[PDB]
Amino acid sequence: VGSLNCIVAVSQNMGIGKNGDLPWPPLRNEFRYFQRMTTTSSVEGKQNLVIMGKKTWFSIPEKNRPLKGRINLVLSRELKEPPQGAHFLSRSLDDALKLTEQPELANKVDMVWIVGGSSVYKEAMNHPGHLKLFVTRIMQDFESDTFFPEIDLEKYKLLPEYPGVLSDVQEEKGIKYKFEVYEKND
Ligand SMILES: COc1cc(N(C)C[C@@H]2CCC3=C(C2)C(N)=N[C@@H](N)N3)cc(OC)c1OC
């Protein structure tokens, strides 16, 4: 099976990218939380599937692509074939999810993680079913050119706690941040 999850790190001004990189300086424990959250599977035989748009894929340094221990799928209407290193290419969220039934991606996937960018996140939030949003709130403003959509607070609900998610405010390089989990089911 699995579940459908979105993971994102956002500045106060809802920024997630700037010219191909993150808006903020490197936050090592944020990177570690991202890697752990998306990689961990305790089902023998499966791996998580990570879904990302073209901009996100290329924002990841070549030394870190494909994301080890995970099935990498790029979502794009403009690419003609899977970028080098990616396992699959799909033209829409719908098709990607459809892909996780057919013979190859069915017996193999545990969780599904949507890791960016803006358009995929949009696609996903407006997708039927039970979605969880894993949100890293970076408590500072940063100049950005890519953003995360606002979260209807009325619609999604904030989970006071979730297993493997720290409750306390973190700090690195003088930047404070906290982890939050939201959920919906429509
Ligand atoms: C600039 O260097 C790097 C950039 C990236 N990007 C852009 C993907 C980002 C990383 C952090 C993050 C992402 C995806 C997310 N969707 N949700 C949260 N919470 N956090 C990934 C890297 O390694 C995996 C990397 O190498 C260290």
Side-chain angles (χ1 to χ4, degrees), residues 1-3 46 100 106 109-112:
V1 190
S3 37
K46 300 167 172 281
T100 71
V109 172
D110 182 13
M111 307 196 293
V112 177

Side-chain angles (χ1 to χ4, degrees), residues 68-97:
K68 306 166 261 206
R70 284 149 290 181
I71 298 163
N72 291 234
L73 178 162
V74 176
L75 198 67
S76 180
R77 273 147 99 98
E78 305 196 346
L79 301 183
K80 310 252 116 187
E81 86 231 31
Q84 173 177 154
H87 307 282
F88 297 92
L89 166 79
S90 308
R91 151 190 252 208
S92 74
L93 211 206
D94 282 322
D95 289 3
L97 292 188

Side-chain angles (χ1 to χ4, degrees), residues 85-178:
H87 307 282
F88 297 92
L89 166 79
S90 308
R91 151 190 252 208
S92 74
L93 211 206
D94 282 322
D95 289 3
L97 292 188
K98 282 186 278 286
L99 182 63
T100 71
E101 312 274 291
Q102 269 188 203
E104 200 177 351
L105 275 212
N107 187 8
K108 290 171 186 195
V109 172
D110 182 13
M111 307 196 293
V112 177
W113 289 94
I114 285 140
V115 311
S118 31
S119 89
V120 184
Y121 289 138
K122 268 48 158 304
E123 264 189 82
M125 260 169 208
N126 181 33
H127 173 101
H130 173 77
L131 179 64
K132 284 181 219 97
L133 260 40
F134 287 80
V135 187
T136 306
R137 295 288 199 189
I138 294 174
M139 294 170 48
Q140 281 189 28
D141 287 340
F142 297 83
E143 223 158 63
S144 292
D145 59 29
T146 325
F147 295 83
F148 189 70
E150 278 185 321
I151 290 145
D152 203 14
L153 259 201
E154 293 181 352
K155 174 174 308 158
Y156 287 82
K157 135 160 193 273
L158 184 66
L159 271 37
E161 53 291 307
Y162 190 85
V165 184
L166 302 159
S167 258
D168 47 300
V169 178
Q170 315 299 311
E171 252 217 61
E172 303 173 75
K173 299 218 215 316
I175 297 169
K176 285 180 155 63
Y177 58 88
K178 59 159 190 329

